[PDB]
Design a protein around this ligand. Sequence first.
Ligand SMILES: Nc1ccn([C@@H]2O[C@H](COP(=O)(O)OP(=O)(O)OP(=O)(O)O)[C@@H](O)C2(F)F)c(=O)n1
Ligand SMILES: Nc1ccn([C@@H]2O[C@H](COP(=O)(O)OP(=O)(O)OP(=O)(O)O)[C@@H](O)C2(F)F)c(=O)n1
Ligand SMILES: Nc1ccn([C@@H]2O[C@H](COP(=O)(O)OP(=O)(O)OP(=O)(O)O)[C@@H](O)C2(F)F)c(=O)n1
Ligand SMILES: [Mg+2]
Ligand SMILES: [Mg+2]
Ligand SMILES: [Mg+2]
Lengths: 533, 533, 534
Amino acid sequence: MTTNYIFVTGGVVSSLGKGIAAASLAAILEARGLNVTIMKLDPYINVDPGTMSPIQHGEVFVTEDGAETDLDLGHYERFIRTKMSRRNNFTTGRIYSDVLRKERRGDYLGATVQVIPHITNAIKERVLEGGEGHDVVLVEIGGTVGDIESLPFLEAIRQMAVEIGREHTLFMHLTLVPYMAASGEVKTKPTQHSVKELLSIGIQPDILICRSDRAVPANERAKIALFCNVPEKAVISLKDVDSIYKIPGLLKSQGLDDYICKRFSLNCPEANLSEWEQVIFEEANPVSEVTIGMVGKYIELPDAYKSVIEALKHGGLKNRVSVNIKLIDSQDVETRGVEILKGLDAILVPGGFGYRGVEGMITTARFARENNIPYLGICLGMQVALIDYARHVANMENANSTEFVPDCKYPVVALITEWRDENGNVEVMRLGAQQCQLVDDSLVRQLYNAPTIVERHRHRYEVNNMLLKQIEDAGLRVAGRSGDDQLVEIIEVPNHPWFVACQFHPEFTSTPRDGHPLFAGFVKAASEFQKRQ
Amino acid sequence: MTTNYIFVTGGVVSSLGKGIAAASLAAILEARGLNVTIMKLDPYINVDPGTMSPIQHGEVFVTEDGAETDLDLGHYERFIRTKMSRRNNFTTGRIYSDVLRKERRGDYLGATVQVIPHITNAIKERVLEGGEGHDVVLVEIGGTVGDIESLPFLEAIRQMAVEIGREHTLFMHLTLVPYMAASGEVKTKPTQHSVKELLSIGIQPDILICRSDRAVPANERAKIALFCNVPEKAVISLKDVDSIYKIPGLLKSQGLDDYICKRFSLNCPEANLSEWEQVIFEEANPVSEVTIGMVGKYIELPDAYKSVIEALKHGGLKNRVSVNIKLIDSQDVETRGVEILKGLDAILVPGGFGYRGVEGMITTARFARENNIPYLGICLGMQVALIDYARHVANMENANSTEFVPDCKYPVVALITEWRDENGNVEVMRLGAQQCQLVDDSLVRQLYNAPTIVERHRHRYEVNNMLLKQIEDAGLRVAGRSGDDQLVEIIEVPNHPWFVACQFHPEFTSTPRDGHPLFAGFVKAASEFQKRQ
Amino acid sequence: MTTNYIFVTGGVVSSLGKGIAAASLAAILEARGLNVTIMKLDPYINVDPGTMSPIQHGEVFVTEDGAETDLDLGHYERFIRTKMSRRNNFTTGRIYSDVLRKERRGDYLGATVQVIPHITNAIKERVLEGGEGHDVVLVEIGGTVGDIESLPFLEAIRQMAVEIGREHTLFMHLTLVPYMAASGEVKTKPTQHSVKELLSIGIQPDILICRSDRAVPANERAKIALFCNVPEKAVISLKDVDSIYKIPGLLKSQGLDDYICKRFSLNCPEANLSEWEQVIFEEANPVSEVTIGMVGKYIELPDAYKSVIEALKHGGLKNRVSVNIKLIDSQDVETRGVEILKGLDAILVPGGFGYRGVEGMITTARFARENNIPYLGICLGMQVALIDYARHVANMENANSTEFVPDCKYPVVALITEWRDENGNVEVTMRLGAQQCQLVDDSLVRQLYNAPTIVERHRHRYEVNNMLLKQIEDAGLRVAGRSGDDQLVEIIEVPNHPWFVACQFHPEFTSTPRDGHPLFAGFVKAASEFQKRQ
Ligand SMILES: Nc1ccn([C@@H]2O[C@H](COP(=O)(O)OP(=O)(O)OP(=O)(O)O)[C@@H](O)C2(F)F)c(=O)n1
Ligand SMILES: Nc1ccn([C@@H]2O[C@H](COP(=O)(O)OP(=O)(O)OP(=O)(O)O)[C@@H](O)C2(F)F)c(=O)n1
Ligand SMILES: Nc1ccn([C@@H]2O[C@H](COP(=O)(O)OP(=O)(O)OP(=O)(O)O)[C@@H](O)C2(F)F)c(=O)n1
Ligand SMILES: [Mg+2]
Ligand SMILES: [Mg+2]
Ligand SMILES: [Mg+2]
C-alpha cells in the first residue's frame, strides 16, 4: 500500500481557493472509504503564524496538539474527519530555521549548504513525515507559480515525483479564467501562460481546475487541453458558488475522483455525498431569520473571525435559522453608545488581545445582560463578561485585567503568577486540547450532554481564583473548571435566558455536518428572543 | 559626492572569474585616484565559511577584524589597497538568520514576513552599509543568473538601481563565448540567452564581459550588442591569460574605465598601471628556477592553499626566481617515506586541522632539518616543527598535541586551559590581526626590519609554555611572542640555513606589488640551496 | 504496425552536429533490420537552398528526384541506404508559401489563418507525408531551442506527440557540455538552462546527447539526469572523435538503440556494425600517403565542397591511401602563378558559378595536363578543362563560356539556346537530378564503372557547345560519355595523359564510405602511382 500524493498549485492570481478546492477533493476521496490527509506549505518567512496579527493574516487556527497554524487548516477539519497536527503545516522560515541550526551544529560535515539539495531535502522530509501512513495526501503549495517565494517548494515536489514515480503522484493546477464584458466570453490566455510558467520549472500538470465567476464551456476547456498537454477529461470547471458545501458535488459530477482513483489504481466504492447533500438542503431552506451582532476589535478584516463566523453558520443549520451576522466595532460603542446595539437578536464577543476597544466590549456584555439578550463570549468575551458582573453587580469599582491595567485594585483576570487580591495578598500560554469538567445542573451540562468535554485553548490570562468567591456570592455561576489548579473555564448568569461565556475557542471544533452544541443553543436562543418581540 | 555602485553578475556557467574581473576593474579605478571597495554576496546557506571544509570550498580567508570569509576577498586585497572587513562578504544564511531573529523577537509588529520586501530589504541594507563612504562600490553576486539561489540577490539590486537611479548604478554581466572546433568560430548564442534570462528578472545589463579561451572578434561583439540592447563599446573581451596581473591592462585598453567614469560623471586622471606593468615584467623574466614542495593534507584541492600558493609567487617576483610548486601528500610520506622529498630546493608545510597525515608532516619537518633544506611552517607547520625538535632533539618521547593525542605525556601543543607538564602539574579560537613582538638578533627581526609586526591568526591550540624551557635549552630559539600571556608565535633553528615556523597566516598579507618579507627570504634561501648542488 | 517518431533538437549552441548524430543513430537502427528514414526541418525563409550561395550554409545537396536540399541530407545517404527525396527536407519559407497559396485561393473558407493551427498543421502534414510508411522516423529540427525561428516547428512536433501518443514518440535533445580550463571540469549548467527552455515550450525531452571535447563522466551525467526529469540511463555522452564512422559504435555501447526499441516495443536482433568496423579498420591502416590539391573559389568555407572532400576520403579507403587535401585559391593562381601547384600528386577542380577565379582554374587545368599530373574536374572543372584544351591545343584564343564572356568568338560552353559558331551561325535549362549516361567503349571511365550506362546527378545550366565540339575532337580530345537525345557531352578525357577525366555531373553525391565510388577510386589510385614515380 504505497502512499499517493496530489500536489496542488495555483497560477495567474492568488485568490483561487486552493485550500477549499483541496478540502473538497479530500471530502470526496474520504467518501469512498480512503484515508486522506491534507497539508499546507506556506511561503512566508514567519516560523509560525503565532507572531502574526489577525488584522493582516487572519485567524490563527489551533490544532489538538497545540500548534498555531494557518487558517486553511480550519477548512481541512471542516471537510474531512482526519485530525490536523503540527505536521500538516510548515513555512519557509521553519525550513531555514531547521537547516541553519544543523549547519551551526555541524551536522552537514563541513559541506556547502545549498538550496539544492539541502533546502529541498528538508522540504521533502516534512512532506513525507506528515504524509506517510495514508492512502492519498494532498499537498497545497502556497503562493502563485512564477514567484520567487514558492520556487524551493516547487523544485522539491518535482524531485518527489521522480523518485516516487508518476504512478503515485499527480499535479493539480488551479488557474483563473476571467470573463470579459467586451467580448462576452471567458479568456483562457492567462491559463496558457501559467502552465508554460509551471513547465519552465520542470512540472507538467495533470489536472487543471479552472476558477471563474461562471462555468467554463467545453469549447474553452478543449482549447486549454490543447495548449497544455492535458487530456480534456482532466480539465475541471469550478465556478463561483454561494456555498462551498456544493463544491464536492460539483467536482464529483465531472469525474475528478474517478480520474484520480484510476491513476493511483484504487478500487473503492462510489462517493457517498449524502451528508453534504443534507447540509446544502438545510442551508437552502431556513424557516426563520435572526440578526446576531459580533462585537470585536479586528472587524476591519472579517477573516480574523473565520472559524467564529463559520460556527454561527453551523448553528443555523441545526436550527433551520438564517443567521445574519453583523460586524460592529467595539470602539464605536465607546464613542456612540449602546445605540448601535439595538435591534439585535443576539450578541457575541469573540477573543482578542490588547486594551484597544475593550471598554466597549465590557459595555456590550452589560447591555446584553440588562436587557435579557442572548450572549456568547469566547476567551476575551469571557473576560469582559466577568468584568461587567464584578464591576456592576459585585460592586468591584474599576475591576479590570492585568493585561490592560497592571496595577488595578480588582484584578479579576491575571496571570497565574500575578494573582493577588484587593489588598495585595498572594498565595503560598495554554495551547491545544484540554479536558474540562462541567458543573451539574448547568446550562452547558445540558447542551454537551456529557460530564467532561475537550476544547482548544489559546490564551495567557486566567480568572483570578482569589476574587472568584466574591463574584459567586453576587449571583454569578461557574460551569466549567479544569486542571489541578481548577481554573475557571465557563461562566453563566442564571437570571438570564442565555448567557454563557467560555475561555477556550469552541469555533475550532465546529463542523457543518456535526455542528457544535454551544453554537446550536446560542442560535436557538437567538430565534426565541426574536419570537418574543 | 553620491556613492556609485557596479553590480557584477555571471551567466552561462559559474567558472568565469567574477572576483578576478571585479578586482581588476577595481585596480584600474583605484589607479585613477578613486576610493574603491568590493563586496561579495554568496548564495549558500552557511552563515559563514568558518564551518566549511577546505576540501570542498577552498581556503578560509581571514580579514583584519577576524572574519572568516570567502577566498574571493583574497583576490580583492591583492588587487586594491582597501582593507576588507566583515561588511565585505555575507551569505544567504546570514540574511535569513537576521530576519528570523527579528521575527521571533517581534520587530516586524505582527506583519507577514515575506521575501519581498523583508528579505530584499535586509540585502539592500548590508550593501549600503558596506558601500557608503566610497566613490565606486563593486558588488559581486555569486551564482549563475537563472538559478533559484541568486534570485533574492538579483531582485534586491534591481530595486536599488531604481531608487539610487541609473545615473549612479551599472550592471556588468559576464558570459561565456565558447569556441567550437567544428565551425572554427566562437558562439555568442549562450550570451544571447543569458541576457534574456537576466532581463526576465528585471535587470538590463550595461556592460558585457565576454570570457573565452581567445579574444572575441569585433564581428561577434557587434552581434552581441545587437541582441542585448548594449552599445558596442560596452562589450568587452576578456580572454584566457597566463597571468591575472595582465587583466587590468587588458580592460583599460578597451576603455572599460572610461565608460564607467563617463556614466558616473567622474573626472579623474588617467589610470597609472605602472606598478602592474612592473609585476608582469618581473614574472615574465626569471633569472633562476627552484622546486619548492608543499606537504599538506588538503592537496586534493589546490584551492585549499590559495593564498599560500600566491604568496610563493610573490616571493619569486621579488627575487626574480621561477618557483615551481609541487603538491605532495603528507600521507604518502607515512607510506612511502622521505623518498618523495628528494630533489626539493625547499619544503613548506601549511596549516590545517585533524590528525590525518600529521605524522607525515612531522617526518617532513625532520627531513628538512637534518639535511639543511629551507623550511617554512604556517600554523600546523609550526606545530609539527616543534614536535620534531622536542621528539628527536629534546628526547621527549612521543611528544604530540592534545588535538591529536589528548592524553600524551609531552603535550607540547595544547589549549591554554589544557596546559600541563610531563607529570600532570598545571598553573594557578583566535581570529584576526594581532601585534607580535620579535626577538632581537633573530632571522625574522632582520627580514621584517621592525620591532613589532602585525599578522592574522586562525587557530585554537597554542604552544605549551610549561614545556618551552626544556626545548629552548635543547637549542631551539623563540623569535616571536605576543599578548599578556606571551604566547609563542615564531620559532627558529639557528644551526640551519633557513628554518622559520610561525603560528599566524602570513599568506593573507602578501601582495604581488609589495610582496611579503617572510616569503621573500624563504624563496631567496631556496635558490641559494639550489646553487650549492 | 504503427510508425514511430524520434524528434531531434539542439540546445546551447548550433554547431552540435545534429545531422551526424541523427544519421549515426539511424545506422544502428538499420543494422537491426528496421526500416528507418530521416528528414531535416530548416528554419530559414528560403523556399529551397537552391537560391543560397555555397559560402553561406555550405554545399547544395541534390537528390535523385532533382531536389536542391540542405547538406545534412548528404550525411543521411552516407549513413543509411534509404534514398532521400524532396519530402525529406523543407523550410519555413516552404510552409508559408503553401499556406499563403491556399489562403489566396480560398481553401480556408474565410477563416482567420493563424500560426496555430494553420501553420502547425502544414508542418505536421509534411512530417507525416515523408514519415508514414516506415518503422522509425528521425525528424531533425534546425536551429537552437529558444530562438524565434524554430518555435513553429517545436509547437507542431509537440502536438504530434499528443495525438500519436508517447508510446510511439521520443524527444532527443542535444546540448553542449563545455570544459573549463579555470576549474578543470565540464559544466552542466548550459544543459540545465536549455532543458528548462525546452520545457517552457511544452516539450519534455526523453534522451539527452551530451556534446563535449571529451567524455562526460558519470557524475555529470547523473547531475543532468537530476535536474531534467530524464532517467540516468537516457543521458548519452558523445565526445569529439577524429572519425565520424566511430559514432554508431559509441551510441551502441551506451545502449541508445536498446532504450529506443524498448520504448517503441520493437523486437529486433542486435545491431551488426561490421560494415562500420571495416571502414574504421581501413581508415586506420593505410599503406601509402598522397597529397591532392583542390583548387576552387569557395575554399574560405570548407563545407562548400563537403561531398567532394568526403568522396576523396572514400577513394582512399578502397586503395588504403591516406589522402591529404590541400585547399588552394584559384585567384592566387592568377596573381602568384602556378608556383603554388608544385608538390601535388593530383589536382581536383570542383564546380561553381561566376567568372571570379575561373582564369585561375583554366591555368590549373593546363598545369596538370602539360606536366602529366592526375586531374579530375566536376561541372566547372570540366568547363575549364574544355577551355584549356581549346585555347592552348586546338588554338582557339580567348575561348570561354557565355556565362563569363557572352560575346566571345569561341563559346565552347553555352546554353543550348545560345549555341553558335565562330562565324555566328546557329542550329535549326536547369538540369537537376539523376539522369542516365552512356559511356564510350575504349575510354578510361568505361573500365572504371565497368558498365555501359551509369546514373549520376546533375546541377548545372551551361552545356558543352556541340557546334564547336568536333573542332576540339580532331585536336586530340576524347569524348567518354554522352546522354539524352541531344547527345550532350558528359565526360571528356585526354588520352596523352596518365589520368585526365572531367565530368559534368556531380559524382560525389553518390559516393559512400561503405561502397566508395568507381571514379574517385581510380583518381586516388592514379595519385598514388604519381607519388611513387617522384
Ligand atoms: N503558444 C501560442 C498560443 C496562441 N497563439 C496565437 O493566439 C492567437 C489567438 O489569440 P486569442 O484569441 O486572443 O487567445 P486564445 O488562444 O483564443 O485563448 P482565449 O481567447 O480564451 O484567451 C492565435 O492566432 C494563435 F496564433 F494561436 C500563438 O501565437 N502562440
Ligand atoms: N532572438 C533570436 C536570435 C536569432 N535567431 C535566429 O538564429 C539564427 C542564427 O543562428 P546561429 O548562427 O546558430 O546563432 P548566431 O545568432 O549567429 O550567434 P552564434 O553563431 O555566435 O552562436 C537566425 O536565422 C536567426 F533567425 F536570427 C532567432 O530566431 N531568434
Ligand atoms: N535549478 C537550480 C540548479 C542549481 N542551483 C544552484 O547551483 C548551485 C551550484 O552551482 P554550479 O556548481 O555552478 O552548477 P552545477 O549544478 O553544479 O552544474 P555545473 O557545475 O556542471 O555547471 C547550487 O548551490 C544550487 F543551489 F543547486 C539553483 O539555485 N537552482
Ligand atoms: Mg479567443
Ligand atoms: Mg552564427
Ligand atoms: Mg559544480
